Amino acid sequence: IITLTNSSFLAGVYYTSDSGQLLAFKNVTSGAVYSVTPCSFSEQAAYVD
Amino acid sequence: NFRRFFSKFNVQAPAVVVLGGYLPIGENQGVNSTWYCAGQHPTASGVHGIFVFEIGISQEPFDPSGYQLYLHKRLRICQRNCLFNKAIPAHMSEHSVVGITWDNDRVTVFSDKIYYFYFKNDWSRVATKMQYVYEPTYYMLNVTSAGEDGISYQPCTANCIGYAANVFATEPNGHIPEGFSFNNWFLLSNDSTLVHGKVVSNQPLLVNCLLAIPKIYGLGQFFSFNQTIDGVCNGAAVQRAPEALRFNINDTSVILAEGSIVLHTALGTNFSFVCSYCFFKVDVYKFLAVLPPTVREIVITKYGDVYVNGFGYLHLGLLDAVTINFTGHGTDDDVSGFWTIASTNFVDALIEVQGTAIQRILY
Amino acid sequence: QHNFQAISSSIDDIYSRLDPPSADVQVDRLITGRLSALNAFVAQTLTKYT
Amino acid sequence: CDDPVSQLKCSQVAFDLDDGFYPFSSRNLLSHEQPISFVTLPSF
Numbered sequence: 001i002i003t004l005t006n007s008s009f010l011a012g013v014y015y016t017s018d019s020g021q022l023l024a025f026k027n028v029t030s031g032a033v034y035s036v037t038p039c040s041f042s043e044q045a046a047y048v049d
Numbered sequence: 050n051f052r053r054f055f056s057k058f059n060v061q062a063p064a065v066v067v068l069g070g071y072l073p074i075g076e077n078q079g080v081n082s083t084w085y086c087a088g089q090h091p092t093a094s095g096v097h098g099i100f101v102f103e104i105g106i107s108q109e110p111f112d113p114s115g116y117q118l119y120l121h122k123r124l125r126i127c128q129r130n131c132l133f134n135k136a137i138p139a140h141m142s143e144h145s146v147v148g149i150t151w152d153n154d155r156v157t158v159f160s161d162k163i164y165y166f167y168f169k170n171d172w173s174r175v176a177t178k179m180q181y182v183y184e185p186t187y188y189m190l191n192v193t194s195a196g197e198d199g200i201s202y203q204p205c206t207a208n209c210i211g212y213a214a215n216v217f218a219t220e221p222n223g224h225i226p227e228g229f230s231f232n233n234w235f236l237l238s239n240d241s242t243l244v245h246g247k248v249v250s251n252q253p254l255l256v257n258c259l260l261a262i263p264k265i266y267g268l269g270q271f272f273s274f275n276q277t278i279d280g281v282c283n284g285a286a287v288q289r290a291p292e293a294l295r296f297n298i299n300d301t302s303v304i305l306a307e308g309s310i311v312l313h314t315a316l317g318t319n320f321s322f323v324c325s326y327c328f329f330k331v332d333v334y335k336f337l338a339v340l341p342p343t344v345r346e347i348v349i350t351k352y353g354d355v356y357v358n359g360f361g362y363l364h365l366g367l368l369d370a371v372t373i374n375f376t377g378h379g380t381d382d383d384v385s386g387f388w389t390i391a392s393t394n395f396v397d398a399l400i401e402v403q404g405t406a407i408q409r410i411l412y
Numbered sequence: 413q414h415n416f417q418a419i420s421s422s423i424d425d426i427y428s429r430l431d432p433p434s435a436d437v438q439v440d441r442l443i444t445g446r447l448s449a450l451n452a453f454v455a456q457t458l459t460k461y462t
Numbered sequence: 463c464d465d466p467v468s469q470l471k472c473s474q475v476a477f478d479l480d481d482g483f484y485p486f487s488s489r490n491l492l493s494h495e496q497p498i499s500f501v502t503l504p505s506f
């Protein structure tokens with residue numbers, strides 16, 4: 001999921017964590033940064049009886 | 050009084066800043082003075098600026114092919130051959146200061162704004178009918194409120210150049226001193242920019258020479274990748290050829306002029322910086338980058354590698370020299386320090402970044 | 413980060429580069445690699461728990 | 463394996479599960495129809 005985000009990273013064109021996974025990228029023509037998130041997130045189901 | 054004069058340097062109210070360059074020396078502090086209050090027609094040479102009715106500025110050989118200046122109260126910048134022959138308003142408060150400074154083919158004027166002009170000249174000779182300045186001076190502004198009030202200016206020695214947060218005193222071994230802010234010293238990458246972490250990377254952080262150039266002044270200079278760069282070293286100089294040179298500025302308007310950055314290859318080919326979207330005219334056109342709205346750092350290194358804001362936009366053949374043409378600043382917030390140029394050599398350094406900027410380094 | 417002798421560490425990248433048959437062989441290299449890295453993490457936590 | 467409880471049972475291989483916490487994936491969109499996004503640097 002690509003969501004426009006409200007930070008203002010000045011350096012680079014796209015950003016990755018220390019593990020090399022894409023975190024955000026910058027629209028160069030406008031300077032706006034968009035964060036990239038997984039489509040689904042992990043959960044824990046509580047299974048009793 | 051200099052309250053109005055320094056308010057022309059548009060600065061935020063609660064900010065304390067450092068002024069550098071050919072400013073008014075002052076009438077009472079130091080040696081300085083030389084305020085020619087009377088029409089004595091003083092005659093001095095080697096002058097690089099005047100402050101304040103007749104003014105005549107000319108080359109020392111008094112070349113008829115060189116343009117001389119004559120201000121009388123009308124202004125004529127003329128050879129026998131006239132470029133400007135007109136009349137200019139000359140009304141000011143008695144405490145207002147108007148000055149002109151010439152250096153490196155550049156002229157700066159203080160007529161209600163910090164006007165900047167490019168003009169190839171040699172203007173040490175001058176006659177007049179109120180003081181001279183030959184060497185750069187330095188001030189501090191303890192500004193506390195907008196306008197004239199709260200500026201609280203004072204003069205100071207050269208040590209104040211270390212007060213500005215964007216310049217540093219280079220250690221004798223070439224290391225950047227600890228505690229530097231690295232405000233716009235982006236780590237260099239051809240790829241994704243690390244957000245938060247630590248990397249041991251080969252980066253040009255072994256600085257040999259740092260030029261703290263006042264914001265209001267541009268720079269026309271020739272740098273070579275085989276000789277030590279010229280200019281006044283801010284700290285301990287290192288007599289080493291630059292593997293990279295790093296330009297740290299404030300606003301993008303410095304570079305927008307055509308031919309601002311001219312890169313000379315070992316083949317002798319010239320790459321001229323052009324914007325309209327920035328290309329490198331080859332004398333064909335090579336696309337550099339869609340220039341970001343805020344250019345803060347341009348680092349150019351031999352091995353044919355140019356970076357804007359710490360990104361690998363373009364790679365070229367092995368360079369040997371660079372010529373600049375930087376064009377001052379926007380005259381809307383200047384001299385809150387200096388815009389700098391650092392000659393650097395590559396080094397393996399441990400770099401910690403949070404956000405996207407360096408925060409501490411270890412060679 | 414580690415591409416366990418596969419084409420790349422990005423699994424969608426593998427499926428774009430390779431055909432479905434050979435991609436299955438390539439992605440199985442990193443599935444084995446990540447599973448062994450996941451088992452190593454578990455084995456050392458159970459040691460901490462003991 | 464349609465019920466989320468049954469989906470959890472089929473996530474493991476067992477008809478009954480002990481009481482506990484079992485990892486789970488958030489129910490993604492049933493219809494994929496995923497739009498294609500492509501971003502690269504401008505070229506000349």
Ligand SMILES: *[C@@H]1O[C@H](CO)[C@@H](O[C@@H]2O[C@H](CO)[C@@H](O[C@@H]3O[C@H](CO[C@H]4O[C@H](CO)[C@@H](O)[C@H](O[C@H]5O[C@H](CO)[C@@H](O)[C@H](O)[C@@H]5O)[C@@H]4O)[C@@H](O)[C@H](O[C@H]4O[C@H](CO)[C@@H](O)[C@H](O)[C@@H]4O[C@H]4O[C@H](CO)[C@@H](O)[C@H](O)[C@@H]4O)[C@@H]3O)[C@H](O)[C@H]2NC(C)=O)[C@H](O)[C@H]1NC(C)=O
Pocket residue numbers: 237238239251352353354361364395
């Ligand atoms: C974005 O992409 C661009 C382009 O791809 C990258 O640009 C690269 O930048 C690196 C530096 O960060 C360049 O590496 C440098 O290459 C120099 C080339 O030298 C040539 O002549 C020497 C003669 O000795 C040859 O050895 C070289 O060939 C290779 O040799 C060995 C063989 O494995 C390699 O290990 C070398 O790296 C060379 O690639 C070249 O033909 C090279 O001289 C230079 O080496 C200095 O630094 C290393 C440490 O990395 C020292 O060990 C070494 O001793 C050198 O330091 C000495 O330098 C001079 C040499 O005379 C001395 O006078 C000094 O006193 C000092 O002791 C270095 O390896 C690379 O070439 C360049 N790529 C291209 C294509 O141009 C960007 O990096 C990339 N962005 C980022 C962020 O990485």
Ligand SMILES: *[C@@H]1O[C@H](CO[C@@H]2O[C@@H](C)[C@@H](O)[C@@H](O)[C@@H]2O)[C@@H](O[C@@H]2O[C@H](CO)[C@@H](O[C@@H]3O[C@H](CO)[C@@H](O)[C@H](O)[C@@H]3O)[C@H](O)[C@H]2NC(C)=O)[C@H](O)[C@H]1NC(C)=O
Pocket residue numbers: 191193201
């Ligand atoms: C730079 O400016 C700040 C802001 O204060 C402004 O400048 C001063 C020189 C005065 O003209 C102020 O009227 C003006 O608003 C200075 O901070 C202030 O400095 C003054 C004295 O220099 C302080 O007054 C004294 O401070 C001492 C220690 O703090 C007290 O013990 C005294 O009782 C007396 O209050 C004042 O507190 C201080 N802060 C404020 C909010 O005014 C600053 O000194 C000045 N110089 C530098 C180098 O920063």
Ligand SMILES: *[C@@H]1O[C@H](CO)[C@@H](O[C@@H]2O[C@H](CO)[C@@H](O[C@@H]3O[C@H](CO)[C@@H](O)[C@H](O)[C@@H]3O)[C@H](O)[C@H]2NC(C)=O)[C@H](O)[C@H]1NC(C)=O
Pocket residue numbers: 027028029030031501
């Ligand atoms: C990244 O940022 C750039 C810069 O804002 C975005 O480009 C913008 O795209 C929109 C939609 O194409 C342009 O809107 C214009 O609307 C008029 C109205 O009809 C139309 O005639 C134009 O042809 C255009 O569609 C907008 O002008 C344009 N901005 C520019 C050119 O500066 C871009 O969409 C962003 N996203 C990317 C590149 O993924």
Ligand SMILES: *[C@@H]1O[C@H](CO)[C@@H](O[C@@H]2O[C@H](CO)[C@@H](O[C@@H]3O[C@H](CO)[C@@H](O)[C@H](O)[C@@H]3O)[C@H](O)[C@H]2NC(C)=O)[C@H](O)[C@H]1NC(C)=O
Pocket residue numbers: 166167306307308309374
């Ligand atoms: C370094 O930068 C300066 C400043 O841009 C360069 O001077 C500029 O040179 C151009 C080329 O001729 C001038 O354009 C001309 O302007 C006149 C108006 O005076 C116009 O009539 C011509 O048609 C042409 O457009 C430009 O004005 C001039 N800049 C200034 C402030 O006068 C200089 O050439 C550069 N040096 C190098 C070595 O690149």
Ligand SMILES: *[C@@H]1O[C@H](CO)[C@@H](O[C@@H]2O[C@H](CO)[C@@H](O[C@@H]3O[C@H](CO)[C@@H](O)[C@H](O)[C@@H]3O)[C@H](O)[C@H]2NC(C)=O)[C@H](O)[C@H]1NC(C)=O
Pocket residue numbers: 061299300301379381382385
């Ligand atoms: C050059 O550096 C200066 C600071 O070192 C910056 O430009 C100036 O930044 C100040 C601080 O924002 C601006 O002043 C104030 O801006 C706020 C914004 O909300 C406004 O509310 C205030 O009334 C006041 O204007 C100042 O305008 C600005 N100067 C400009 C835009 O010319 C900036 O880092 C660099 N300037 C540029 C143009 O990049």
Ligand SMILES: *[C@@H]1O[C@H](CO)[C@@H](O[C@@H]2O[C@H](CO)[C@@H](O)[C@H](O)[C@H]2NC(C)=O)[C@H](O)[C@H]1NC(C)=O
Pocket residue numbers: 313317318319332
């Ligand atoms: C490429 O640029 C170089 C500048 O480094 C040019 O060489 C100089 O051109 C000036 C022009 O006024 C001469 O005064 C110098 O004598 C030349 N040599 C040097 C060493 O500076 C060169 O002519 C340019 N070539 C092209 C094709 O543009």
Ligand SMILES: *[C@@H]1O[C@H](CO[C@@H]2O[C@@H](C)[C@@H](O)[C@@H](O)[C@@H]2O)[C@@H](O)[C@H](O)[C@H]1NC(C)=O
Pocket residue numbers: 275276277288289290
């Ligand atoms: C390039 O430089 C070579 C080495 O000489 C020195 O190089 C650097 C380290 C500086 O100290 C410089 O002042 C010295 O000259 C020379 O052998 C070579 O001739 C030079 N070539 C050119 C074209 O200048």
